[PDB]
Ligand binder design. Sequence first.
Ligand SMILES: NC(=O)C1=CN([C@@H]2O[C@H](COP(=O)(O)OP(=O)(O)OC[C@H]3O[C@@H](n4cnc5c(N)ncnc54)[C@H](OP(=O)(O)O)[C@@H]3O)[C@@H](O)[C@H]2O)C=CC1
Ligand SMILES: CC(C)(C)n1nc(-c2cccc(O)c2)c2c(N)ncnc21
Ligand SMILES: CC(C)(C)n1nc(-c2cccc(O)c2)c2c(N)ncnc21
Length: 275
Amino acid sequence: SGIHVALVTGGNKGIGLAIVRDLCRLFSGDVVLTARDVTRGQAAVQQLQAEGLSPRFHQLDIDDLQSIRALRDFLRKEYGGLDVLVNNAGIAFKVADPTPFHIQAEVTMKTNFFGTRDVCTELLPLIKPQGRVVNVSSIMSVRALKSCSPELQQKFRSETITEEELVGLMNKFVEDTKKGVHQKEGWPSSAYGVTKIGVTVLSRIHARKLSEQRKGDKILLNACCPGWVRTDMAGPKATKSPEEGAETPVYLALLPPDAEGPHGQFVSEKRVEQW
Ligand SMILES: NC(=O)C1=CN([C@@H]2O[C@H](COP(=O)(O)OP(=O)(O)OC[C@H]3O[C@@H](n4cnc5c(N)ncnc54)[C@H](OP(=O)(O)O)[C@@H]3O)[C@@H](O)[C@H]2O)C=CC1
Ligand SMILES: CC(C)(C)n1nc(-c2cccc(O)c2)c2c(N)ncnc21
Ligand SMILES: CC(C)(C)n1nc(-c2cccc(O)c2)c2c(N)ncnc21
């Protein structure tokens, strides 16, 4: 019977902000906007208040384990857990950024894969029955999968892969870039794309454990692509507004209590894609 709660990571701008706004109107309970920068997060909450909405705020940097754990403790204390988690935070380097490629790989992987993973380690145990988890991946993960060796494709499509095996492979990509050997070892050229392979596969693994370990709790967990969205990441020439980009993530967050699925899927335009 307690009040329900939804939370979005990377909520101060871009798709994440639009997701928060829609959950404020459509989610029955509190909605927590989180942001790594407290100033930007509070400004975004003030923006939504000027629109008539009442999100809560909590700081969260998915790359700081102490930030994650403080949020965990807040959720336990204030709500006794969590109903909806949207792992939206992510980064990408632009074309021709002068940062060395192996550092771009390390940095992008650190946030998009390892930060996401650490949020899930701490917050998935808090998800309540009928909860939903939404991981914002990218269609670039499907695109990058095709460019992997056959051996890595089999590993990434496996229904038996463990989280610890995936972790090893994600770190292997990054180390291989530093050694100048990633393509020889079967990896694609796109570092961002490999990080999103990690998000997609992590989603599949976490869904399988939910089915294995929490039969009966009616939790649904999926990965998704929001499409090509005008944000600071993609720039102003992209196809969709943030409002449009939010639609598939919000759909997946708000799947009705009696939904049988999707679960463990990669979803774009509200439709399941083959992995
Ligand atoms: N735009 C697009 O076309 C597409 C985007 N995506 C994915 O959608 C998600 C949102 O992207 P988008 O809105 O475009 O990007 P933006 O750059 O506009 O927004 C990214 C959000 O993530 C936050 N963030 C980044 N790193 C961290 C971190 N360490 N801890 C907490 N928050 C963090 C940012 O905070 P801050 O303001 O402090 O930087 C910001 O709130 C990402 O996962 C992206 O990979 C997928 C497909 C397409
Ligand atoms: C119907 C939903 C809940 C998606 N929605 N969206 C919006 C909306 C409209 C314009 C921009 C935006 O971000 C959201 C909205 C509104 N203004 N009033 C009532 N419901 C609204
Ligand atoms: C630059 C192109 C047009 C190839 N692009 N970029 C993206 C893109 C931009 C930023 C992040 C991301 O994951 C993907 C994209 C997309 N989601 N769908 C279709 N085309 C896309």
